[PDB]
Each structure stands twice: as C-alpha cells, then as structure tokens.
Amino acid sequence: MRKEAIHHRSTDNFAYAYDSETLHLRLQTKKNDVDHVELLFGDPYEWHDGAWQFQTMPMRKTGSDGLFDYWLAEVKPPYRRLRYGFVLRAGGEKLVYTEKGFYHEAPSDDTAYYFCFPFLHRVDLFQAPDWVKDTVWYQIFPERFANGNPAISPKGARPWGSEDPTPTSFFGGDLQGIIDHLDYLADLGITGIYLTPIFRAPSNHKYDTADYFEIDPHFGDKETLKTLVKRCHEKGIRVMLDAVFNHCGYEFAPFQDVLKNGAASRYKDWFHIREFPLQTEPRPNYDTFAFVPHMPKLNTAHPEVKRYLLDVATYWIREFDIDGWRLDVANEIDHQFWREFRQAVKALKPDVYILGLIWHDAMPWLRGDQFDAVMNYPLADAALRFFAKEDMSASEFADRLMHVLHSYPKQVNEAAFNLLGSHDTPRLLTVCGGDVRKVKLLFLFQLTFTGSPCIYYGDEIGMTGGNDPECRKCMVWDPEKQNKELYEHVKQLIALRKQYRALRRGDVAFLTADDEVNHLVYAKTDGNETVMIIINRSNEAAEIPMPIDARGKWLVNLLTGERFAAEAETLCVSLPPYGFVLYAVESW
Amino acid sequence: MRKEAIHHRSTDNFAYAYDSETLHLRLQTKKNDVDHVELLFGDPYEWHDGAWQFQTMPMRKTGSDGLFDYWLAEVKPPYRRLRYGFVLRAGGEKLVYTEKGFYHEAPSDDTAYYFCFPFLHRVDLFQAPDWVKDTVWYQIFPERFANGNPAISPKGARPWGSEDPTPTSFFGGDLQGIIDHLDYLADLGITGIYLTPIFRAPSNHKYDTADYFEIDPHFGDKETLKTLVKRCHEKGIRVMLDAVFNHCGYEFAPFQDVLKNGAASRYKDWFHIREFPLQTEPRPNYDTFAFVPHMPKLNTAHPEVKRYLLDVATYWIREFDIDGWRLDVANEIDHQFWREFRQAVKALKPDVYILGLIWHDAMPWLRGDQFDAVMNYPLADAALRFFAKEDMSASEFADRLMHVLHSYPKQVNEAAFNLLGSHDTPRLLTVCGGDVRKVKLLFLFQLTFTGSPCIYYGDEIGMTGGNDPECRKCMVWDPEKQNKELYEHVKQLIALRKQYRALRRGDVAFLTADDEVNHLVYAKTDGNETVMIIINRSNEAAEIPMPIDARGKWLVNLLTGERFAAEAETLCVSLPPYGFVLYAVESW
Ligand SMILES: OC[C@H]1O[C@@H]2O[C@H]3[C@H](O)[C@@H](O)[C@@H](O[C@H]4[C@H](O)[C@@H](O)[C@@H](O[C@H]5[C@H](O)[C@@H](O)[C@@H](O[C@H]6[C@H](O)[C@@H](O)[C@@H](O[C@H]7[C@H](O)[C@@H](O)[C@@H](O[C@H]8[C@H](O)[C@@H](O)[C@@H](O[C@H]1[C@H](O)[C@H]2O)O[C@@H]8CO)O[C@@H]7CO)O[C@@H]6CO)O[C@@H]5CO)O[C@@H]4CO)O[C@@H]3CO
Ligand SMILES: OC[C@H]1O[C@@H]2O[C@H]3[C@H](O)[C@@H](O)[C@@H](O[C@H]4[C@H](O)[C@@H](O)[C@@H](O[C@H]5[C@H](O)[C@@H](O)[C@@H](O[C@H]6[C@H](O)[C@@H](O)[C@@H](O[C@H]7[C@H](O)[C@@H](O)[C@@H](O[C@H]8[C@H](O)[C@@H](O)[C@@H](O[C@H]1[C@H](O)[C@H]2O)O[C@@H]8CO)O[C@@H]7CO)O[C@@H]6CO)O[C@@H]5CO)O[C@@H]4CO)O[C@@H]3CO
C-alpha cells in the first residue's frame, strides 16, 4: 500500500465546511491501491477512562483522475469541533493515517496524533449567491451585438462581409440594441447577461478605460442603462458588468496628469513607476498590463486608488442595481484589496455575484474571503480538446475533469462560471471545423454539467470566426442567415436543464471505459433525480451499453419523450455518428 | 519514476514570496526517486516567434523526511510575474511537470499548461516582526515565580516538600516579584518575558478571566506594570502577554448578567446559547471551552464582542507599550476576527508579536493576514520523543524535523515560537527521569535550532514535577537547591546563540546515517558562518565521524575555545555518554 500517494491536510479542497453544520473531508490515495477507508473521529475533548473516546464511519470513493482516487466524508461535529484520522484497510494490510504519520493501530492516549478541524465557524464559511447555481449566462460584447439608437461613432456599417469583417474598428453597437433584441434572449431561455466593459473609453473594446464613473456615450447614458436592467430583471434576467481594476486606460485623467507633471504629479503613487522620465521606447519603464503602454497598472495598495475603485464598485451596485462583477485580470491584484472589495460590495447587496477572471488554479482566492467563483477555464480547455479537436480520449477527458473538480471544495464548483469561449478565443464552430454536430455535443456537455454555464452571443446561431478580433463579428440578425437548428438545440437543452436539478446541481459520475476511447457516458444525480448522458463521439454508428439502475421503474428520453420501462441489467443504446441521448431514470 | 509522489501547487509552503523581490518554489517527489530537477520558468507575457520564451535554472534538494525529498528554487521574477514548470530527470527518463499534467517535452504554444504565480505584491507578503528571530524567551507563571509586596491573597506561603504543595490553590506570586529578580534573568541572558494571564480573575491561573481591563489585584496595579514594562525594555527585554479571547470567566460581568435574566439580558448574543434555560447540569447547554462550565465561549462574530476584545487588545499596547500578544486557543476563533485583530494591533505598533496558540497544523493562520507564528508544539513533541523518552532514532527525529519544517514557508519557521515546556506539560527533568544530562541535550538542541526559543521558569535551575499542577511549583530561589551547573550551562548556550548568527536564523542540515540510532550530527549554516553540532544519544562513550568542508581553514570549539587546523577528510570526534560538542568551522 504505497504511502507516497496517501495525502490530506486540514485546509482548502481537503477539509472544509460545506454548510454551517456539515464538514467535508477528502482523502487522497493511489488508483485502486486501497480497498476501503474509514473516517475515525470524535470531539476533541470527549475523554474517558483516560483514553480519548471516538467513533468511526466509512468514507465513499467519489471518483479518480489518472493517478489518484478520492474519498469523501460528510460529518457534523456534535459540538462544532473535531479531531480526525483515517483508517485504510487494503487487502490484509491495515493503516491509520494521521497528521503525525502512519500507525499500525489507532493511538488513543493523545489527540495530538490526529488532524484537527478546530471550530466550524459560520462566518468563515464559503457561501456564493444561491441563484447563480440556477442561471444560464449569455455574454454580449456590446459593440458587435445590435445597433439601436445611432448614438454611435463615425465608421463602418453592419456586416463588413461574409468572412473577416473586423480589424480594430467600430460597427456601432449600443445598450439600446440589447434592450431591443431582449425578446430574443428571453426566448432562447437565458436568465443572465454579462456585458463586456462599457465605460467611457477609446477603443471598440472598453478595457483601456478612461473614466469609470461614466458610461461610454457611444453605448448610451444612465437612462438607457437603468432601463436595460429594469427590463431584464422584469423578465427574470440578471446583469453582470465588467470590472477592470488591474489597470486603467491611457486617457485616464490621473495617468495623463502623470506626464503633464512627472515626479511632480499629485498622482504618482497611483501607479507603479520605476524610471520617472516616462519613456516607452524599448518597452514601458513602468508596470503595464502585459507590455501594453496604453494600459498602466493601478496601485490597489495605495490608499486612494483603493477608495477610488471601491467607490466605483459600489457606485453601480447602488445607482443601477446590477447583479455582479466580472473581475478582469483579478489574479494580478493583492488579496487584501479583494477582501475589502468583497466586504464593500456584499455589505450593500449580498446577492452580488463576484466572479473573477483567473486563468490558472484559483484556490488562493476561493477560500471564501475573496471571490465567489472564477472562469472555469481548465474545464473549457478539456471540453474543446475532447469534442472539438478530438485530442484526448473519453477517459483521459473524464480524468482531467475529475481532477479539477476535486481540487476545490464541493460548493466552490456549484458556483463556477463554465464557458466554452469568449471574445478572446476562436468561435466554437470554426474550432470544430464547421461540424455543427460537434458544436451540439459541446453545448450538451456544458448545459448538462453542474456550475453556472454561459453562452457567447454568436455561437447559438452558428456564427463563425477565428481568433481575436474575428470572434467579434457583428451578431447575425438575419433569420435566413442564422442556424435555427443549433438554436433550437440550445433552446431545448436550456429549458431541459431548467427542470432537471440533477443537470444543474447534481454530481457527475463517469462510467468511463479505457476501451471505448470514443464513447462517453456519465450520469448526474441529486437524491432521487438521476439523468444519464450517452455520447458517441465517433464518426460511425455505435452501440453503447448503459447501466440501468436496479431500483429503476421507468426510463424517459428527455428529447424524444418516449418513456419505456427499464428492466434489463444493461441497455445497449444504439446511436448514429456524433450522436447523443438523455435518459431520466425512475424509482419503484 | 513515481508520479503519485510528485507534487506542487502555487500556494502555501509550496509557492510563496519570500521577500519584496523573491519567490520560493518547492517541489515534492519520492525519496531518491529523482536524480535532478530543473525549474523551467519565465515571464507570462514574454514572447517571440509565437513561441513562449522561457528559460531554465536548476533547483537544489533542500532535504527530505521519510517519504519525500524536497526541492527549492529561489527566483527573482522581473516585472514580478511568472508562469513556471518543473523538469525532473532520472535514469534517462526526462519528465516535464506542469499544472496541466505530465509531458515528455516542455510545451511552448501557450503558457496555460504551466503553474502560475501572478504578481508578487508586497502587501500580501508574510512579515513577522524581526526581533523575535533574535531573542530567547523566558516564560513565567506569575503566581509561582517571586513574591514581592504581599498584596497577595490569604493562603499557604511557600512550599512544604520538594514536590508536595500545589493542588489548585495559591502561594502569593505577584508582579513586584518579577521586577525584584530581573537581574537573575538579565544575567541568564534571556531577552523577552512571556507571562501567563494577569487580569482580574479568581484562580491561581488567570484564564478564568473576569475583566480584561483590570490587572488582577493580587499581582499588582497599573503603576506596577508600567514599571515592569518600563524596566524590562530598559534592560533589552521584551514583554508578551496572554490574551484569553476564545472564552471568558464565570465572573465576567456580561456573562454574569445573562445568568439572572437569560432571554432578557442585553448580552444574550455575546455568547453561544442553544436552549435558554441556561443550565450546567450533565454538561453545559451552551458552548464552553472544552466542557468547562465556568468558561463560556465568546461570539467573535457578534459586532459588540469584536469591538470589546479589539479594544482590550489595543489598550495594553497604548497604556503599557507591551511587545506581544499570546493568543490562547486561537485556533477556535474565526479567521475574520484574527484579520481585524492583526490590523488593529499592527496598525498601532508594528513590532507587536502576534503569537497564536495552535497545537496542530497551523497553516491556515500563517498566510500573513493573521498570526505572526505559532507554538512549535510539533517540534517539541519530536525533541522529547528523541532525547528524553528515547523512542525514535536519530533518523526518525531528523525526518519529523524535516517534515514539519518543509510544511511551512521558510520565513514562517524563522519566527516560530520554540518551546519545550509550559505550565501544561510535565517538567523536562522529570520527563528525563531526573537525568540532568538529557536535559542539557534538549537545551543544546533547542538553543541551536532556528526560531524563537522559550525557557520555562524553573527549567534552568532544574526544578521538577509532572502534569498540571506539578509543573507549577513555586520558583526555587535557594542557591542551595538549584542546579547551578544547568543554569551555567543554559547561560553559555544562550550567550552562544546570541553571538553565532547561524545558530539563531540559519539553516539546519542533518548528516545522520540510516543505520544510526544514537548519533545526531547536524550543521547550522548562514553565509560563511557554519556551526556543527555532534550529539551522542547513548549511555556509552562513542566515536562519531564528522565531515569537514574543503575550504575549512579552522575548526573551533565553541565552549572550550580549543582551535585546530582543518586539514583532513573527516574528524572522528570522541564523546562521553550523552555527550555533545559544538564546532565552528572557520574557513578561508
Ligand atoms: O484556557 C484553557 C487552557 O488553554 C491552554 O491550554 C492549551 C495548551 O497550551 C496546549 O498545549 C493544548 O493542549 C492539548 C493537550 O496538551 C493534549 O494532551 C490534549 O489534552 C487532553 C489530555 O491529555 C487528557 O488527559 C484530557 O484531559 C482531561 C484532564 O486530564 C483532566 O484533568 C480534566 O482537565 C482539568 C485540567 O487537568 C485542570 O488543570 C484544569 O484545567 C484548567 C487549567 O489548569 C488552567 O491552566 C487553564 O487552562 C488553559 C491552559 O493553561 C492553557 O495553556 O484552564 C483549564 C480549564 O479549567 O481543569 C480541567 C477540568 O476539566 O479533564 C480533561 C478532559 O476535558 O483531555 C484533554 C483534551 O483536550 O488536547 C489539548 C488540546 O490541544 O491546548 C490547550 C487548550 O486546549
Ligand atoms: O489592450 C490589450 C488587450 O485588451 C483587451 O484585452 C483584455 C481581454 O479582452 C480580457 O479578456 C483579459 O484577457 C484575459 C483573457 O480573458 C484570458 O483568457 C487570459 O489569456 C491567456 C491567453 O488566452 C493565452 O492564449 C496566453 O496567451 C498568450 C498567447 O497564446 C500568445 O500568442 C501571446 O499573445 C500574443 C497574441 O497572440 C497576439 O495576437 C497579440 O495580442 C494582442 C491583441 O491581438 C490585441 O487586440 C490587443 O489585445 C487587447 C484585446 O483585444 C482587448 O479585448 O493587444 C494584444 C497584445 O499586443 O500579442 C500577444 C503578445 O502580448 O501572448 C499571450 C500571453 O502574453 O496566456 C494568457 C494569460 O493566461 O488572460 C487575459 C488576461 O491576461 O484582459 C485583457 C487585457 O485587459
């Protein structure tokens, strides 16, 4: 029984509080290295006969990547506090893993041997807005969406052409447009929209922001905005704006003032500047986004900058009653700042969803003191890799997913922002090579996977385009020109997720086979509710055997409707090329 | 090459900023499973040819416990950002470890694959006061040290037998006393006293706290303290106090109130009470320390308490200028409180040492937003295990030591509070079975290890006594009944640590052999200063071999002065049973 692979710490994804009463303890072991494993536990002060009184329940296997197996244990400390150790019987061997080491028998003279989860506090608890767990997001890069009132800038008219429209010049979008095609959304079934930056700024993309307190005229005015939110909410649609706090635009008052005066400027400390005769020759002598001079890094550490932002952050939550902030390049800001940020925001509107943009691992932020969630990129990479480019197998895929899933605490996932693409990556279609078939499978997986899914304005009606700035083509409002089949597909799937909690709140369970390198089958569960998903990611007709739960009564096809009685041990499911099917199991 | 054992995550002890411009990256791998390992790094936005421009430097093995070896990479990231990966070689096998997985060749099409340490913000940087690293702590339990002005309570005056007195009832210790024996301390060499709780409370010990704003009379008064404090500083001695916040006393005003009113009392929320007919029958129906009725837990979540306690914390820092708070049962309070706590305090007096009392793994609190350090109880467990009880071998010791050490970020250990005993643990001497020899070995080890050591009043003159309240015998001031040899021993060892930088803030390195069970040989290094310690943990004269570095010119005995030319491969050192020797290796 290899020990180099047995691991647990009482922190982050291994030990945490799920709710204000239940603790979650995850243990890591090698793949099939250990048969069973029990959670040995008890309240830290429950002593008797000079020996620590303790009881022991058993942990279940909740999945495994390509190396480890993961064990979960759900427990409620009688007296809000607990000490704990692990007991793993693998074959004839029997170990007891403790913070102090491995012992052939459970020490009982002292608690010191065991890991400890002090007090389960409700305040330290991690709780993200319960609603995002049920919404379906739709991102709409304002500029290229719909032209309502022509309070637009002077240049190019809708659809430059069939291919390649878009260099780095405007088409004239605007908030009004969104308000107008607001019926479209409500029909597609979405419940939340996320607008990319919209504050007074020089580009078609509002990231090189100029004034955070003013909405870009080319988009609208306070009136226009509060109306968009009114209509939205009115229909049950939430709104999340884009918070660009890591850096500011070149036209930002204070930064401009820094050149007007140099070392003199009353705003030097608002940025990070080394050399003062600001020269951008080889490259900026001050910290800028990547190396983009026209985008200097703010100084979230400075006292003022902090209050400038903090006010902004709250300004819109109070002035327009928005529903959340997409924090841009969030990972490049001091956690302290985010701590104050969350406090300011959450003190005004608890329900404000605080989504951050972090590409890599985000444990450091999702401790419950900073972000509500983060863009689940590691997931996207996988989905595309599997369905689009067909690089990894179904198991490799299943593995990569199990792995990420287990690197955060349970609830951290339930609020994750799962997207497949955005305004920075190649349109979902083109990445599939125009094989809509694939695109539908991507939507399926994503719309039938717990988290908080988001759709990029063009993808549902089959919009094609390469990388930036191609993914940003003007939304197609020509009935004839948009793929209604893809649209109906997403529509029904969205409404499907809408009435099958399992699909949006349950846990995944891959019944993977290291043999069916192209057959992927997983099931979502929530109490009684169980939905089975089968996918033949093959270019040939396949026959995939599906495990029918013994306890099943009925078996319904969420697509076809046909509802037949389950009966055999298994159900060989026949599917066409790149085909799929959703089955809802029963109980009686 | 076992992958189940390799591990790293960008966070905690694995990836942290050491200082303003330095990052430490640790890699975990199986013991001896890997020959070499190179840190593959580079800036996130550094590009050319569409290929990410990254470079490589090699990591050094910083030691290993029982199951893993450990690697450290000290990198100075320019522009402060970094995306990085590891490259571990072996018997021809060459693997590339990235957050995204294992590859036989470092990917270069996109940084997404690599681990990431975003920005190296200064404000999030962990910085515990600096002096604590350069001090040795003497801890005194007020009620049993020295008796000055007898404003003492009415009870037994001084001892009876050599170990008889002490049941759970007074003797007359008081602050004046501490003052009247400074010379003793000043002479011993200690430079910081940490004294048990001294606030109005009806108990020989003062955790039963009844008023956090008044010095229990029996010890003295406001004026007395200002003196102790005024004088200590004068002598170069710092003062730390015991903050008892996890719970209050039974005679605590606010709790008293709640006793006669219950559902009424303005203070109903100040604590934790389920059923309101407040009863201490089979056991409290309200949250209390362990199950100690007269010690109810506080609500550090409640707005008033928080303001109350935060003021207490600040009070004794303004009015008496103390240098450090000892936070008792700290692990049972919600981190948020410890964050506000740290701010209030540090804001008033940066040098305030905020030491928490956490037994188990204290990572969650050592992120830099809460405690400055914690009681190194894991290392105390090892020491005793090895020297006194003599269970584990020199290897098992050297391992546990490497394990606890590698589980925190370097600068966290530097400020760790290294104690060997308290008023809760049995006296070394008795734990050594009365073998003063072992004892001196403990002191030797303790005063040779990096951290901030703390001697327990009495242990220097070799007092005796087992568990509570044995370890609380009145202090022996009779020159006749106090081991002058031990005192004089600890004294020159302290004076040694004070003059050999390596001994106090350097790195440890065990050269112990696996077949060795009684010979402990280790070196403390810091720059060109190198101190070698040889310990014969055997009741029998021994000959231990000690390697000498090539460059070594001299080799000086620290407690003999004897100095001799290096010139040799090894130096067989002969020691008497339970012997020890400190060598300073001068080298041109
Ligand atoms: O304010 C409370 C307390 O806080 C501090 O104590 C901390 C200490 O600094 C840490 O080192 C640590 O201790 C852990 C301990 O070392 C472990 O061994 C384990 O302890 C278990 C015991 O081994 C086990 O035997 C049993 O304990 C039973 C006792 O044996 C039994 O006698 C009785 O307990 C009575 C005490 O013995 C008695 O002294 C008295 O306690 C009061 C103290 O005398 C007084 O100084 C003060 O305590 C401080 C302490 O000084 C700080 O250093 O308040 C005490 C409260 O009255 O009365 C007790 C009456 O019940 O019953 C116990 C079973 O309940 O069980 C323990 C289980 O914990 O784990 C320890 C936890 O880490 O942590 C402590 C804070 O917990
Ligand atoms: O003004 C600059 C920029 O502003 C806007 O950009 C913002 C963007 O819209 C936001 O979404 C966010 O960006 C975050 C993004 O959401 C995350 O997904 C992520 O990005 C990672 C990349 O996805 C990943 O591929 C890798 O990227 C590396 C590339 O692979 C590598 O080829 C190279 O990049 C070069 C580009 O390929 C090249 O085209 C060129 O890029 C320029 C754009 O074409 C140009 O339009 C403009 O960008 C605007 C953008 O359009 C606005 O919407 O300037 C770009 C720079 O010249 O040059 C690149 C070399 O610099 O290098 C990258 C890595 O350096 O890793 C990344 C990081 O994980 O994180 C994004 C935040 O980092 O914020 C931006 C900025 O506000």
Side-chain angles (χ1 to χ4, degrees), chain B residues 213 302-312 314 337:
Chain B
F213 283 100
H302 184 95
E304 275 295 77
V305 178
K306 198 196 303 299
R307 185 171 146 232
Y308 180 63
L309 292 167
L310 240 64
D311 279 323
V312 177
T314 17
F337 182 74

Side-chain angles (χ1 to χ4, degrees), chain B residues 309-321:
Chain B
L309 292 167
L310 240 64
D311 279 323
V312 177
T314 17
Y315 178 39
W316 316 94
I317 297 181
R318 304 144 66 154
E319 281 314 296
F320 298 105
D321 190 53

Side-chain angles (χ1 to χ4, degrees), chain B residues 343-481:
Chain B
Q343 290 182 169
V345 305
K346 295 291 185 168
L348 233 175
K349 182 172 183 174
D351 308 331
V352 181
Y353 187 20
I354 308 182
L355 154 58
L357 185 285
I358 296 173
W359 245 35
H360 49 63
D361 176 23
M363 238 315 176
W365 297 269
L366 304 176
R367 317 260 204 177
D369 58 314
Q370 299 163 64
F371 299 128
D372 283 306
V374 243
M375 314 273 271
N376 203 328
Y377 270 98
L379 149 156
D381 192 53
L384 295 162
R385 255 285 206 79
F386 182 74
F387 293 107
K389 293 239 266 289
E390 294 191 45
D391 301 309
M392 61 168 84
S393 61
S395 301
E396 295 181 62
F397 181 57
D399 290 331
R400 187 64 195 182
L401 239 32
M402 283 311 250
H403 179 68
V404 31
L405 245 61
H406 279 262
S407 100
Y408 293 118
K410 184 156 156 60
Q411 75 255 55
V412 155
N413 299 318
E414 301 202 303
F417 198 68
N418 299 158
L419 76 168
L420 284 177
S422 69
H423 42 88
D424 310 303
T425 47
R427 297 273 192 164
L428 284 20
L429 192 38
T430 69
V431 182
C432 284
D435 188 328
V436 194
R437 307 184 302 185
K438 298 179 180 171
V439 163
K440 44 179 65 175
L441 275 181
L442 286 196
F443 273 119
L444 173 63
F445 175 72
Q446 156 176 60
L447 296 189
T448 288
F449 218 83
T450 307
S452 188
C454 176
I455 309 181
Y456 183 64
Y457 90 98
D459 282 330
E460 354 72 69
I461 43 72
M463 280 175 81
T464 158
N467 286 293
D468 199 315
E470 303 258 0
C471 55
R472 291 169 180 163
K473 300 183 182 169
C474 304
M475 178 63 168
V476 194
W477 293 106
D478 185 28
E480 193 160 287
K481 196 59 168 61

